Every structure is written in C-alpha cells, then in structure tokens.
Amino acid sequence: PSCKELADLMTRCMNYDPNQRPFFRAIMRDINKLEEQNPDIVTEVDPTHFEKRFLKRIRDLGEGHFGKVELCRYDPEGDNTGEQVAVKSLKPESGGNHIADLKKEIEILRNLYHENIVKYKGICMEDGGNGIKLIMEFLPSGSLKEYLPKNKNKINLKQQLKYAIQICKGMDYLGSRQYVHRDLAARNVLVESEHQVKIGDFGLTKAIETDKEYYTVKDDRDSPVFWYAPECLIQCKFYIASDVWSFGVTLHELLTYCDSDFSPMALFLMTVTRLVNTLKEGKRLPCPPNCPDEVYQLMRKCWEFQPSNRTTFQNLIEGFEALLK
C-alpha cells in the first residue's frame, strides 16, 4: 500500500513462514490502535526482469540458427550462491532483424502453461532497446539426442514408450490454441531428470486463422530439408498435421537411440526434385532394424503423405496406451 503504517501490518500478516504469522487478537488490537493513531483519511520488485550487470558466465553450451544459449548464474549477493539459468540471447552477427522475432517469441512463452513445456523464468534487456535476452530454466540432462547415446544400454523399452507418449500431450496442447511449431526434432525436445520431457524453444511459431486452415511462407530456405511436409513445397502452405510426419520421424529416431548414420538424411540415398518424386511415388523409408512390429506398424499410418489420413494426437496416445497396457 501507500501508507507506511498499513504496510507494516500487511507484511506481518502475509509472512512466508506459517508459524510466524500473528494471532488474530493481536490483529484486532493493532487495527484498533491504527484507527485512532491516524486521523488522516489518506518502486516494485518485479522478479521477471533481469539486468546484465549481475549476470555471471560459467560456460557455453548449445547453439541454433537464430541465436545462442549459455549457462549463467544470477547473484546480486556476495556471489556465494545464486540460481543457475539458461539465457537465450541473440548475437551481433547479422542481427539486423532478430528483435521482432525475439519479441514475438517472448510473447508466446508468456501465454502458455503445461507440464511438458520448458518453464519461462523472465526477460532481460539493455539500454539500447535491442539486446533482449530470454532467460529460462536449465536442464542438466540436455536434449534426448545428447542423452540416449549416453545411456543406450541402461534404458529400457518401457521408458522409450513413456517418452514417445509424453511429448504427444504437449503437442496436442500446442495444437489446441491453433499454434504450429513448424519444426520438431530430437535436438529441440528436452529431457529433465527421468520420465519427464519438455518441449524446447518456439522460435518459428506462427498462428493460423479460423478462415484459413494453412499458413503462408514467403521463403522456404530456412526449413530443414527432410522434415518437410509435401504441401510445404507443392503449395507452400503449413497445416497442423504437417508435424505429424515430424513426430513420426522423431519416434523413429527415438527408437534408434540417435544412431550415427540411421537418421533419414543420412539414411536417404537435385534434393528437392528427388524428394518430390519419391513422395509422389511412395518411396517411404522402411522400418528401423530390430524394431518391434506393432509400434512401427502403428507409426506407418501417420507417415502417410495425405494430411487427411493423418490421425489426431489423441488417437495416437490412445493407441500407444492400449499397446502399453
């Protein structure tokens, strides 16, 4: 509040230690005293903002096609202890337009809430208006691509089924509010501790309209070559079920433990023309080696090039839970 005496009472009542809050009779006594004591009838501590001056670097890890990510510790105290954070930031190299997309990305992560999504922690900026730096939580285990090779033998098919299941709920949550992530792969999907996976960044997020079930792209050079729905080249239109193919490829890699050369780009043997002709001719990739029959038999349906033949994520989790049971 704006009155010195009342703020004291509110602070005493609203203490974070439940055994230090005062008794109600003391509250009544203090209110009665305050009433007669003051005949007069009449800077913020917002934690979501960070300042670069108190950010301390430790090491660098991770990079992307639209920014860099580093590990830092925030400690305005005597630097004895603090909180380890991951700081999404741009780079001066050709950063003439990253500001708008970074602002939009900040906007998206402030309006989402689900368990299978990386938490938002705050924002940071400098005096120049540019230099905006997103700060989000840090996952010690990194992404799945960096985890499965490290524990290929220790892991089990049970946890593989669990991991394949969990990201589907996050994707369904994203599709609920009419968002398309436009890029899904192992490097983006994160894993924390065990049995928990949270989706990574949302840089290329765009929202479709009710009157048009597809988005418009002016330049397709940014998209990766072999995570590419056929409509993205045939008509340059982005549909929600486009990432279903992406999820199927991610599932295949998940069963593959991120092998050295079994990735479809490495597995495949003028790239655009070859891809188009193979898609029209149905030259789909075969099943993974040593793969159980039922899972890839189920996955084969979603790989179908027709968007209409693709199933909803709800149906996929239904099938997966039926198989698990």
Ligand X SMILES: Nc1ncnc2c1ncn2[C@@H]1O[C@H](COP(=O)(O)OP(=O)(O)O)[C@@H](O)[C@H]1O
Which residues are the active-site residues? Answer: 183
Q: What is the DSSP letter of 118?
A: P
Rule CB under 6 A: is residue 143 a binding residue for ligand X? yes
3-class DSSP assignment, residue 35: helix
- 89: its two tokens: 């930031």
Would you count residue 138 as binding ligand X (CB under 6 A)? yes
CA gap 185, 134 in Å, rounded: 22
**Residue 55 marked in a binding site:** no
Of 124, 134, 166, 201, the one binding ligand X (CB under 6 A) is: 201
Instruction: Report the Cα 11 to chain-centroid distance in Å.
Output: 37
Rounded least distance, CB 200 to ligand X, Å: 5
Map the footprint of ligand X across residues 2-21, applying CB under 6 A: none
Helices 157-176 and 242-255, packing angle to 10 deg: 160
Interface mask (CB under 6 A) for ligand X, residues 95-124, using x and -?
A: -----------------------x------
Q: Is the dihedral of CA 31, 37, 41, 44 positive or negative?
A: negative
The least CB distance from residue 15 to ligand X, in Å, is 32
In the list 30, 137, 172, 231, the residue contacting ligand X (rule: CB under 6 A) is: 137
Nearer CB in complex with ligand X: 9/112: 112
By C-beta, is 214 or 228 nearer to ligand X? 228
Question: Minimum distance between the CB of residue 86 and ligand X, rounded to whole angstroms?
Answer: 4
The verdict on 182 binding ligand X (CB under 6 A) reads no
Encoding tokens for residue 301? 């349906």
**173: number of Cβ within 10 Å:** 18
Q: Which two tokens stand for residue 94?
A: 């050709």
Least separation, in Å, of the C-beta of 28 and ligand X?
49
Six-digit token pair at 230? 């056929």
86 lines the binding site for ligand X (CB under 6 A) = yes
Q: What is the DSSP string of 229-291?
A: -THHHHT-EE-TTHHHHHHHHHHHHHHTTS-SS-SHHHH---HHHHHHHHHHHT----PPTT-
Q: Is residue 64 a contact point for ligand X (CB under 6 A)? A: yes
Cα separation, 203 vs 106, whole angstroms: 9
1 lies in the site for ligand X, by CB under 6 A: no
By CB under 6 A, tell whether 250 contacts ligand X.
no
Among 116, 188, 205, 246, interactor with ligand X by CB under 6 A: 188
Q: Which is nearer to ligand X, 7 or 61 (CB)?
A: 61
Question: Count of alpha carbons within 13 Å of 30, Cβ hemisphere only?
Answer: 14
Q: Interface with ligand X includes 184 (CB under 6 A)?
A: no
Q: Which residues pair with 85 in a beta bridge?
A: 72
User: In the complex with ligand X, which residue's Cβ is closer, 192 or 259?
Assistant: 192
Looking at beta carbons only, is 190 or 299 nearer to ligand X? 190
- Whole-angstrom distance, CA of residue 182 vs CA of residue 202: 9
Q: Which amino acid is at 321?
A: E
Residue nearer to ligand X on the CB measure, 62 or 307: 62
Among 200, 241, 243, 257, binds ligand X (CB under 6 A): 200
Annotated binding site: 61-69, 88
Which residues would be at the binding site for ligand X (CB under 6 A)? Answer: 61-62, 64-67, 69, 86, 118, 136-139, 142-143, 146, 187-188, 200-201, 203
Annotated binding site for ATP: 61-69, 88
